[PDB]
Amino acid sequence: QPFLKRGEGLARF
Amino acid sequence: MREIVHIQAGQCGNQIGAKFWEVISDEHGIDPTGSYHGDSDLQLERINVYYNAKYVPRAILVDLEPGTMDSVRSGPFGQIFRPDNFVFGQSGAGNNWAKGHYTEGAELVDSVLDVVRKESESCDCLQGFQLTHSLGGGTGSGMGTLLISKIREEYPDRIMNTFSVMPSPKVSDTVVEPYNATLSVHQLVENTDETYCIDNEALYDICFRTLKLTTPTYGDLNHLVSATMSGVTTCLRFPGQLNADLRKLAVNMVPFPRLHFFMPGFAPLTSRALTVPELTQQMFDSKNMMAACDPRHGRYLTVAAIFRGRMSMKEVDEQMLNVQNKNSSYFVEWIPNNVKTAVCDIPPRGLKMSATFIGNSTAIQELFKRISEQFTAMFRRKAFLHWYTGEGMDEMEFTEAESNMNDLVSEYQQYQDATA
């Protein structure tokens, strides 16, 4: 299973 | 922006979500049948935000456990909900985040998103999503976060709001809860715009110490949650005297994208009306916080205060000002005017005057420290780790989430000590 990376949601801004 | 799409997942999610609809239905005069029986056009001006015209809540009920849909459907207001909106499985999540995020949850998630999608497409203009879930269990936590990420993928430009209950052993002495909540908090820092931290630890303490309840039940704690959720949504639901949606709120409350975890509060707490000084004092009191953090241990980045009821605005403005003036130390000085007040003339049921508090405080790191210490205690003895990896979940996700949450803690700490 691939998992969410740190800062991956920061890309939206 | 107008409409809000409500999602409730898991046991905790559905029980607080049900209580939320009862309170605000009563506030809007929507009866258990979906019939309007209110006494003022104010109650109906923004009914559209949470209801579809009889009035049907724009809510999607989700669980991997079957029985919780039975228990809400026969709940006090269980008939208002659209039947088609109930999306549930039979397996269950077994308090296992990885079952909720990756296996049992992944099998049910596309079915939910089809209901979400048809609720979205019916909206004039979509304002965002709000989710009620617990972080200590399996469905609300694991599948709730899977839903959050799916919605964020399909609606990248919409606001994601969450009311997330934090685990406390005082309420559920289940030792895998720090695992599930850390995995979830990782999801939350990346993918939500606003998260109200509903801390079961604080809920229990309030009920036990403040309310003098010897053995607080989920009904007692949910009483505080429902009142908190009514209060923080007051400006969405009642005519202002404020022209603002969820996005304008997020813009002004969140100075840094990851620091979007709010410490909600309420006054007066309950299970004679207060004066405006009383309201103001109690609203900033640690005892009134729904997150088990001492705000005098940190600093406020931003604060929103909502007063409900007929009251003197010049008294409110003065109370708020002297609190900031008398305790300037507790407020970050490089965000001018970061304490905002709004007032609504409609009070909640059974009350003449109330005040709801939304604080973006660096003291919330104490909540995450508490969870982190419990996660580290379990993780270092590697207990029950196979329950998760056995569902296909990489072990590295554990250390990844723990690192992200610990990064969150220090990020609060540096703004706590930043000077201007």
Add this chain to the structure above:
Amino acid sequence: DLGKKLLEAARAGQDDEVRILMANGADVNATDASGLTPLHLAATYGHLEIVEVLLKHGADVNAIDIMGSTPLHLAALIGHLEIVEVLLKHGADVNAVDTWGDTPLHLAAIMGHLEIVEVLLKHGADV
């Protein structure tokens, strides 16, 4: 190998397996690669009857894995009250510190196992 079968049987709560394995000579103080014994694993997963059976038959109540974890550590951590009491009744080191500096009391406190916190205090736990 009987030791590893016993280890698996203790972790899984297989009461009859534990008995039969022991009847065939299984090493009660077998260790896995990280030093965990059958008593560690039964204490961790809440298997009270196997805990008592292991201790009736020569299990080291104070065995430590690689990380200095005693069985009392793990039961105090996971929250197994009756097992905590049984380990103490058989002489578990109430003040044992593992490789992280933690006593069983401290793990009980961190996890909010308050009945266990009290039990350890009754049995001379330090703080």
Add this chain to the structure above:
Amino acid sequence: MRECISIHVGQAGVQIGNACWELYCLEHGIQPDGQMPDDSFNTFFSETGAGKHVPRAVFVDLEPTVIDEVRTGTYRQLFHPEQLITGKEDAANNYARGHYTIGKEIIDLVLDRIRKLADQCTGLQGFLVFHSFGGGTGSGFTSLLMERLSVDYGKKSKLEFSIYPAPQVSTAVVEPYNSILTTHTTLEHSDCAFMVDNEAIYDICRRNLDIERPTYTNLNRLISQIVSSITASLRFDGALNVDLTEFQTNLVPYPRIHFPLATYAPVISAEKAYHEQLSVAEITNACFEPANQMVKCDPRHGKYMACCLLYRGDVVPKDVNAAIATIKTKRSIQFVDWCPTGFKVGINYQPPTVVPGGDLAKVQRAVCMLSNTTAIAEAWARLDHKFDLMYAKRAFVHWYVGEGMEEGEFSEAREDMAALEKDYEEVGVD
């Protein structure tokens, strides 16, 4: 005639427009449906031929709630329906949403509607733009509109009436960022801008009208009284400021320093008991009292670049000259070095008008002084300081970068503001 098109952008701009057009109708005897019992007010109203007078005005907001009230309210028949323009979701107090992501969705529609008004002008002078500094739309979409209008109407003048945010009147934490961003992008595109400090209007309603908590209506009717004072010359065929270009000529010797201070008198409560009407001298002296300024700042501190006095009502020219002469002997009026020191005088002889039943008493003579003074730099400095405090932590910046704006535009704007503060400092250094 010599038409001016008024554009109202965002909530503040729409609601001030409502008050302004309400007052204009009263001043010219036009009814809420455009009817009334070659006229000079034809600059601001088209004339059909059935005697319907239609404001040369566009209302734009990125959400519909405020403009919906115009379409349903007392003046629902005053404006062309196609004049009132709304999107679906607003700029969320975010300049970048107003200027880039959301604003580009509707900018062409706004320009088409403006083009249709312009095509009904024989000799368009330019535009009057009303907007808040703090709003995502008022700041961000205004800047986009002003850039586009400079290209599509290259030789036309553009004037601004903009609302300066104040903690006492519903500001938000990001507003300072919005104020700087709009000011920087608009600066090269505006010939003259009149700033209204919400705290000054607030102060005046509280002091002069004894309104403890002024509503927007309270504030906007006062604002519209000053705005009407400023645009009267365009609607009554004046001798002074007879066209938009003349505002630059009369008030703005240095193009960047184009923010005159408005001081208005007298503001008198309609509830006050009978009293003698104030003379020309009395209302002229009041033009030099800080409490009457539209922007809070200390004029004693600054120097004047230009100064016009716009009188309305029962005002005899010799009495103006005597009052001004008295001022020059008694007040310390310093002009910057290379600007002529004459006051320019306009007199409109029509009685000043108030909304019937409003807070403002009807008076026999009123005056609005427009002074381009370096003292208003103090207001830019207040703004700039609030911007600096947040920006040093990059607080809230990510919201802007996520909506089509590059982070460098923040420092580019702030640098422009710093040069503007130095413009003020250097023009008035002894």
